[PDB]
Design an enzyme around this catalytic site. Structure first.
Site, PDB file in Angstrom:
ATOM      1  N   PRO C   9      85.145  80.621  43.727  1.00 32.36           N
ATOM      2  CG  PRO C   9      87.070  81.884  44.703  1.00 32.36           C
ATOM      3  CD  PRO C   9      86.562  80.731  43.581  1.00 32.36           C
ATOM      4  CG  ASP C  41      84.076  84.954  51.195  1.00 29.76           C
ATOM      5  OD1 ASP C  41      83.538  84.495  52.378  1.00 29.76           O
ATOM      6  OD2 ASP C  41      85.014  85.239  51.090  1.00 29.76           O
ATOM      7  CG  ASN C  68      83.213  88.496  52.659  1.00 37.36           C
ATOM      8  OD1 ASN C  68      84.100  89.698  52.865  1.00 37.36           O
ATOM      9  ND2 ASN C  68      83.545  88.154  51.566  1.00 37.36           N
ATOM     10  CG  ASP C 177      96.065  83.261  45.110  1.00 37.19           C
ATOM     11  OD1 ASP C 177      95.374  83.136  46.115  1.00 37.19           O
ATOM     12  OD2 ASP C 177      95.331  83.825  44.193  1.00 37.19           O
TER      13      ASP C 177
HETATM   14  C1  LIG Z   1      96.326  89.681  37.895  1.00 40.97           C
HETATM   15  C2  LIG Z   1      96.142  89.143  39.083  1.00 40.97           C
HETATM   16  O1  LIG Z   1      97.218  89.097  40.106  1.00 40.97           O
HETATM   17  N1  LIG Z   1      95.036  88.902  39.622  1.00 40.97           N
HETATM   18  C3  LIG Z   1      94.872  87.886  40.976  1.00 40.97           C
HETATM   19  C4  LIG Z   1      93.638  88.725  41.854  1.00 40.97           C
HETATM   20  O2  LIG Z   1      92.526  88.682  41.146  1.00 40.97           O
HETATM   21  P1  LIG Z   1      91.583  89.790  40.920  1.00 40.97           P
HETATM   22  O3  LIG Z   1      92.108  91.062  41.184  1.00 40.97           O
HETATM   23  O4  LIG Z   1      90.888  89.626  39.524  1.00 40.97           O
HETATM   24  O5  LIG Z   1      90.421  89.397  42.082  1.00 40.97           O
HETATM   25  P2  LIG Z   1      89.058  88.840  41.773  1.00 40.97           P
HETATM   26  O6  LIG Z   1      87.938  89.861  42.216  1.00 40.97           O
HETATM   27  O7  LIG Z   1      88.928  88.102  40.437  1.00 40.97           O
HETATM   28  O8  LIG Z   1      88.881  88.048  43.310  1.00 40.97           O
HETATM   29  C5  LIG Z   1      89.575  86.537  43.170  1.00 40.97           C
HETATM   30  C6  LIG Z   1      88.469  85.510  43.531  1.00 40.97           C
HETATM   31  O9  LIG Z   1      88.045  85.707  44.968  1.00 40.97           O
HETATM   32  C7  LIG Z   1      86.516  85.801  45.236  1.00 40.97           C
HETATM   33  N2  LIG Z   1      86.505  86.682  46.558  1.00 40.97           N
HETATM   34  C8  LIG Z   1      86.556  88.059  46.569  1.00 40.97           C
HETATM   35  C9  LIG Z   1      86.307  88.513  47.778  1.00 40.97           C
HETATM   36  C10 LIG Z   1      85.892  88.068  48.791  1.00 40.97           C
HETATM   37  O10 LIG Z   1      85.613  88.536  49.904  1.00 40.97           O
HETATM   38  N3  LIG Z   1      85.631  86.676  48.702  1.00 40.97           N
HETATM   39  C11 LIG Z   1      85.840  86.067  47.501  1.00 40.97           C
HETATM   40  O11 LIG Z   1      86.021  84.566  47.554  1.00 40.97           O
HETATM   41  C12 LIG Z   1      86.154  86.516  43.860  1.00 40.97           C
HETATM   42  O12 LIG Z   1      84.886  86.156  43.786  1.00 40.97           O
HETATM   43  C13 LIG Z   1      86.977  85.680  42.806  1.00 40.97           C
HETATM   44  O13 LIG Z   1      86.673  84.435  42.570  1.00 40.97           O
HETATM   45  O14 LIG Z   1      93.687  87.920  43.083  1.00 40.97           O
HETATM   46  C14 LIG Z   1      93.232  86.583  42.817  1.00 40.97           C
HETATM   47  C15 LIG Z   1      92.911  86.077  44.287  1.00 40.97           C
HETATM   48  O15 LIG Z   1      93.868  86.126  45.056  1.00 40.97           O
HETATM   49  C16 LIG Z   1      94.081  85.869  41.885  1.00 40.97           C
HETATM   50  O16 LIG Z   1      93.295  84.416  41.452  1.00 40.97           O
HETATM   51  C17 LIG Z   1      94.550  86.663  40.452  1.00 40.97           C
HETATM   52  O17 LIG Z   1      95.609  86.033  39.799  1.00 40.97           O
END
Ligand SMILES: CC(=O)N[C@H]1[C@@H](OP(=O)(O)OP(=O)(O)OC[C@H]2O[C@@H](n3ccc(=O)[nH]c3=O)[C@H](O)[C@@H]2O)O[C@H](CO)[C@@H](O)[C@@H]1O
Ligand SMILES: CC(=O)N[C@H]1[C@@H](OP(=O)(O)OP(=O)(O)OC[C@H]2O[C@@H](n3ccc(=O)[nH]c3=O)[C@H](O)[C@@H]2O)O[C@H](CO)[C@@H](O)[C@@H]1O
Ligand SMILES: CC(=O)N[C@H]1[C@@H](OP(=O)(O)OP(=O)(O)OC[C@H]2O[C@@H](n3ccc(=O)[nH]c3=O)[C@H](O)[C@@H]2O)O[C@H](CO)[C@@H](O)[C@@H]1O
Ligand SMILES: [Cl-]
Ligand SMILES: [Cl-]
Ligand SMILES: [Cl-]
Ligand SMILES: [Cl-]
Ligand SMILES: [Cl-]
Ligand SMILES: [Cl-]
Ligand SMILES: [Cl-]
Ligand SMILES: [Cl-]
Ligand SMILES: [Cl-]
Ligand SMILES: [Cl-]
Ligand SMILES: [Cl-]
Ligand SMILES: [Cl-]
Ligand SMILES: [Cl-]
Ligand SMILES: [Cl-]
Ligand SMILES: [Cl-]
Ligand SMILES: [Cl-]
Ligand SMILES: [Cl-]
Ligand SMILES: [Cl-]
Ligand SMILES: [Cl-]
Ligand SMILES: [Cl-]
Ligand SMILES: [Mg+2]
Ligand SMILES: [Mg+2]
Ligand SMILES: [Mg+2]
Ligand SMILES: [Mg+2]
Ligand SMILES: [Mg+2]
Lengths: 313, 312, 311
Positions: C9, C41, C68, C177
């Site tokens: 995503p 998204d 979104n 998750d």
């Molecule tokens: C250290 C930790 O605990 N990290 C967690 C945190 O990632 P983290 O804090 O890194 O969150 P990210 O920004 O990586 O977002 C996770 C994913 O969701 C997507 N996204 C974000 C916003 C949105 O509106 N739509 C969307 O699809 C992003 O593009 C990305 O691919 O949350 C993620 C998703 O629950 C988990 O996989 C990670 O393990």
């Protein structure tokens, strides 16, 4: 001629072992004709082994068999008490041994001191201590001589006290009923003696709380109704000192952080809480200060607080 | 109008009172610029105390109460009504003034348009500290200069503040009545001064119904302040007083004490009721070690207070 | 059928997204044997993120959501519907795969008939206990500390997800998750741990929705078709409770600068949720937490405050 001492001994499935116990009684420095051994068999069912041993001393003991097993010493000991017309009684458990000078030394000391109760020092094969640290005590006191820490009935009791006050073993509890007998006796007499020249009695080693706390409740009621300790402050003192003993050596004293199931802890504490809440708070100042929080937590019926109290001890 | 009125309550002091009197009459300030008002609280020591006061006839003013009030409050209120001076200085009857006490505090006060001047305390025998550790402060702050830790009335107070706002000592509490006086004064005045050149004042060594009634008045004085009008500032002052109450309050360690259980319940009930009239907005300003104790008190939970005390 | 679908995503990543996509397209696994499914998204970054994605048309699969969703759940669910592969791998749009990730994890999974293959994480703090025994062909939830590594950044057998209708929940924005990994763990038997390389590089409330999600975890455990024994379910639940007290959201809320009223509501939600969990699980909780756990069951803020002072 009234006997000096009746030894009262319950038996249950003891078998050949019993020879040694009976023999310790029949071998006394006291004149054989001055005492008697009363054996009450609680309906042994060991293919006649226990009864075969008892029959080997036919004529040297008095014997009664109960027709059904009572499950503990209370009914058998009560049966013994009805059978005794002696001056003193001495309770002996079937697995233990008397020193050959036990009856003579304890009786003579009793007679010399007009004692209601004579406590001979305990030995162990394979027991209380503070009560015996000062040597022979002609006129002992419950608190100063640590008698709340040695409440087994394995002692010499003046029979007139037992008869006059109708002291019987309770049959509603399989725990602490011995403590209760001794406390009822102490609360109905004045003169206690401690004899320590020998290990006179040898101990051979080998729940909801409903009944237990019912027994504890009867201990406090005996203190507070005592015709001997009549002063209300002395009653508070005795009660607070008992509370201390209970918190030091009571059953499941550390139940709160234990592996007991929650619903069992709640029932246990409800029993403890309602029991101690019938005891005047005036007794609490006589409890050792380290227990201040634990005792209050128990009065408050608060399991979390008892848990915390235990963690801070 | 005299400069300073030394208001001294007396009660069964005896021949040891001489020391105190002469400490006031031997000031460096001009003799005619100050006055010692002695208010005897109907002494009952077979004339001993009366005979000491009589020897200063012509040099002091003296009023005697018909009956013993029981503490310094009513006498002090008598002293206030009599005095028509610029400043008043309250002096307890066993204590001593440094000879430069009235002059140095008054001059410093007049120099800085002070409503309140606090002289450093000394001791005889076996007093606040933090307030005096920075030396002289012309315009002090209650919090920064630790004024809640030095709330005795053994200080130089501007009389007009007292008269205008009808600040009187309360009679209905045997404890903390002095604190309340000082606090009412602080919440109705703006200029406070600290003077430290010498040890200027020498200190010589209940179910809670009345006591917590007084504590309650302290918080009410803070939250109705015409000086500190900002609601958040009132929260800060209240919270800072809470810390002081927990650090130095009467029977602060009642919970694990030898006090009877029933008395502990009544004491905590009063404490609880009082603190629950204080906004929780004040709690964040309380020192974090007292977080549990303070909540235990708001919850009226004696076990929790007992536990809190064990962890402090 | 493809061996692996990587499901990634995206949201407002922009040019940074090139690195992550490059890390996927540069695998040692044959390109024909795997796909990258990108679900955007509905990025709103003036076409920037979608402009990056367009540069790989024909080399990736791609869908953009109409609106979104706010987190990875809906996008990831969309990816699952699109993959008809043997395994799926969730990769976040900010992370990097080792070049030997898909090949080594898939191969190791194939050889041990694995429902779940977990590659060791690097970072540009991530779980460590799970990886400290080296490679494990048939891992155990408890012995291999899997409850301390519940991210979905792992290789999942697709049949398990399809057969059991496992979807990411859109309830809360926390712990979804965990719930996914737990639902999967409770419906599968064979898990593998591979540690040769740092295969995946991690690039660095009222409690209403959050505790609703936790509730779902306990339910997943207690209705597990794999761990069907009741005492075994109590054990797993106790071990989760331990993980919750050790690493949970606002775990030390009680003595915090949180407003009193918020503490009460938080604890009310925690209490309600834990009191749906049989007490028979409590004996499996590490004993140091015994008081804190009881205090939460009792919904007693003072007792929780005290428990935390003693820990
Ligand atoms: C250290 C930790 O605990 N990290 C967690 C945190 O990632 P983290 O804090 O890194 O969150 P990210 O920004 O990586 O977002 C996770 C994913 O969701 C997507 N996204 C974000 C916003 C949105 O509106 N739509 C969307 O699809 C992003 O593009 C990305 O691919 O949350 C993620 C998703 O629950 C988990 O996989 C990670 O393990
Ligand atoms: C260290 C300790 O806690 N010791 C006590 C424990 O002894 P202990 O645990 O050694 O109990 P025993 O096995 O000696 O049994 C006590 C007596 O009761 C008799 N019996 C037993 C079962 C039965 O169904 N009927 C029956 O009459 C036995 O024969 C014996 O005479 O309990 C006894 C009975 O309260 C007490 O006197 C002991 O002080
Ligand atoms: C260390 C400490 O906390 N000391 C305080 C304590 O003084 P302390 O405990 O030293 O009490 P003192 O003996 O100094 O008496 C205080 C004053 O009250 C007078 N008095 C006494 C008894 C009486 O029935 N009527 C009466 O008017 C005394 O004469 C004296 O002027 O209480 C005083 C009055 O609250 C405060 O100013 C002091 O800060
Ligand atoms: Cl023989
Ligand atoms: Cl014969
Ligand atoms: Cl009977
Ligand atoms: Cl003696
Ligand atoms: Cl005694
Ligand atoms: Cl004792
Ligand atoms: Cl004992
Ligand atoms: Cl004993
Ligand atoms: Cl009895
Ligand atoms: Cl009695
Ligand atoms: Cl006991
Ligand atoms: Cl513990
Ligand atoms: Cl304790
Ligand atoms: Cl003060
Ligand atoms: Cl009071
Ligand atoms: Cl105070
Ligand atoms: Cl009390
Ligand atoms: Cl675990
Ligand atoms: Cl199972
Ligand atoms: Cl969490
Ligand atoms: Mg003989
Ligand atoms: Mg025995
Ligand atoms: Mg004084
Ligand atoms: Mg509590
Ligand atoms: Mg990320």
């Amino acid at each position: 001629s009234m006997k000096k001492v009746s030894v009262i001994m319950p038996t249950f499935n003891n078998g050949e072992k019993l020879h040694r116990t009976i023999s310790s009684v029949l071998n006394q420095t006291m004149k054989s004709t001055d005492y008697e051994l009363i054996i009450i068999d609680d309906h042994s069912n060991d293919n006649g082994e226990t009864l075969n041993v008892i029959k080997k001393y036919k004529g040297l003991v008095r014997f009664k068999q109960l027709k059904k097993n009572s499950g503990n010493a209370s009914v058998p000991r009560n049966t013994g008490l009805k059978m005794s017309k002696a001056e003193y009684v001495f309770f002996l458990d079937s697995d233990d041994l008397l020193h050959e000078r036990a009856l003579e030394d304890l009786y003579n000391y009793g007679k010399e001191n007009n004692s209601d109760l004579i406590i001979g020092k305990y030995g162990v094969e394979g027991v209380p201590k503070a009560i015996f640290e000062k040597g022979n005590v002609a006129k002992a006191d419950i608190i100063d001589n640590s008698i709340f820490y040695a409440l087994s009935v394995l002692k010499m009791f003046k029979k007139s006290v037992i008869d006059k006050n109708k002291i019987k073993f309770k049959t509603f509890s399989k725990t602490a009923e011995d403590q209760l007998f001794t406390i009822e006796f102490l609360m109905n007499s004045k003169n206690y003696s401690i004899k320590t020249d020998y290990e006179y009695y040898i101990v051979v080693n080998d729940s909801t709380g409903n009944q237990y706390f019912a027994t504890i409740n009867e201990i406090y009621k005996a203190i507070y109704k005592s015709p001997i300790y009549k002063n209300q402050e002395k009653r508070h003192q005795l009660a607070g000192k008992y509370t201390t003993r209970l918190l030091r050596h009571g059953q499941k004293k550390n139940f709160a952080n234990s592996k007991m199931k929650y619903e069992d802890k709640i029932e246990w504490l409800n029993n403890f809480s309602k029991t101690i809440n019938k005891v005047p708070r005036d007794s609490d100042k006589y409890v050792t200060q380290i227990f201040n929080l634990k005792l209050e937590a128990i009065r408050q019926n608060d399991l979390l607080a008892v848990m915390i109290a235990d963690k801070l001890l």
